[PDB]
Structure 1
């Protein structure tokens, strides 16, 4: 087989997650993203079904791929002396929500709803596979600008979903819930909704609501943009200080504000100039 069944191209990014490149599988000219991750820089490791030692990101990806959307799928992977190449899909054209928001500030609610709903369905998929993303935010959400579809990325901070309490966290602090900041404890589903909460605000206000820990723990939300009474209610519910006062995924999707969402294609036709 060998590593060379792909034709490497530019650098689409780099940072904490690793270093992502623009490849094109030679086998059938299909666009792909190539993520190198040094062995030495990995923290969390798991073991694949077949019984071999890989980074948790690979285990999670594998569980969450299989079937369609919501998530960038992992087509293949390789092990090198001091790293791990991950071959992932590269749909196009594409922009991550952080960049998108940075460019156009806060979004309209009709657009935030399409995006938030799509995000919601992708998190549901992740939980069904037994994966908890743990780092849901605007930087880890790609937007296929042509088809109007969002896809999840970067599981390097995730963990196997479980019903017991989590006493470890390595994602984004400002998206982490109050219960983590105060006792270093949290339950996946509860904590997920909280980050989803921060993300909804972020979309409709053009920036995150909490910057400091003193603001997370307090849990009072100030709105800087014109935002509908209904959208404010859902953001505040998703950010209930008490984890069990936060909504379920079902509750979030049956909320008045999430009715009559636009379909991916419609969404691009109206808001992405596509």
Structure 2
């Protein structure tokens, strides 16, 4: 019934997220704190559509004044971001497990017609068993409803992760952006650096990639199998881009790596 607020979790633009601990049951939860006067509805009513074990569980919302209280899953292992050591990344079996559950979640969401629009290691939280959870549907929206897709036109996300067509086109399909950002997480995961600042013609590193100069700083660190899969994801024409069911068929993905 009453929730002690133990320590901060992430001081976001919205306000802050805090660890919260139940005085009787000792169960720990996280309370994102939206002071509307210093959008938050859609994020709430999206949260009521969600129920999966690779997505932050949503509990309820105390409506005190304008200080909206978002009662969400505690992820005690924090951010996939803090398990990528710079310029090296992590062990290739650890990458695969995390990319498996990224795919479990994106499939699950895409299944119900919602797109996250901001997949990046900062938005993948890990529980006590390092089990990955997709977090913060603040920029997430409906793109399929009554089994009719709606095209996106609003630009958003985080540049280095964002898909090329979110910058050259006026309308674009929600799922291939999501296919593109998860591959930038694959690449972070395996190299420990991001390939380019933004997927642009004006950007040297993305020009190289499209020219297939794969003897250059992040790709050289990536094994031929996962790099074969990244050549399929980070395709510039989102119509030829590998779709999630094809990702599920790929050689690397189905390779036995971890006990």
TM range (shorter): 0.7 to 0.9
- Map residues 3-14 of structure 1 onto 2, 5 A cutoff: 5-14=2-11
Correspondent of 1:190 among 154, 162, 176: 176
Q: Partner residue of 2:118? A: 135
Tell me by how many angstroms 1:39 deviates: 1.5
Judge conservation of contact 1:181–1:217 (CA < 8 Å) in 2.
no
Q: Partner residue of 1:271? A: none
Tell me by how many angstroms 1:262 deviates: 6.5
Judge conservation of contact 2:14–2:35 (CA < 8 Å) in 1.
no
Cα pair distance change 1:262/1:73, threshold 3 Å: farther
- Structure 2 gap ranges (5+): none
Q: Partner residue of 1:30? A: 27
Give the secondary structure class of the aligned counterpart of 1:167. Answer: coil
CA-atom RMSD, angstroms? 2.2
Q: Partner residue of 2:46? A: 60
Judge conservation of contact 2:143–2:152 (CA < 8 Å) in 1.
no
- Map residues 98-247 of structure 1 onto 2, 5 A cutoff: 98-102=81-85, 105-144=88-127, 146-162=128-144, 163-212=149-198, 213=200, 214-215=202-203, 218=207, 220=210, 222-224=216-218, 225-247=220-242
Cα pair distance change 1:40/1:170, threshold 3 Å: farther
Judge conservation of contact 2:105–2:134 (CA < 8 Å) in 1.
yes
Counterpart CA distance in 1 for 2:170 and 2:82 is 31
Could you state the TM-score of these two structures normalised by the residue count of structure 1? 0.82
Judge conservation of contact 1:18–1:37 (CA < 8 Å) in 2.
yes
- Structure 1 gap ranges (5+): 45-53, 267-274
Give the secondary structure class of the aligned counterpart of 1:78. Answer: coil
**2:74 counterpart of 1:79:** no
Could you state the TM-score of these two structures normalised by the residue count of structure 2? 0.86
Judge conservation of contact 1:34–1:86 (CA < 8 Å) in 2.
yes
Correspondent of 1:70 among 54, 61, 76: 54
Counterpart CA distance in 2 for 1:247 and 1:75 is 35
Tell me by how many angstroms 1:86 deviates: 0.3
Cα pair distance change 1:102/1:185, threshold 3 Å: farther
Tell me by how many angstroms 1:261 deviates: 5.4
Cα pair distance change 1:18/1:261, threshold 3 Å: farther
Tell me by how many angstroms 1:257 deviates: 0.4
Cα pair distance change 1:261/1:90, threshold 3 Å: farther
Judge conservation of contact 1:18–1:36 (CA < 8 Å) in 2.
yes
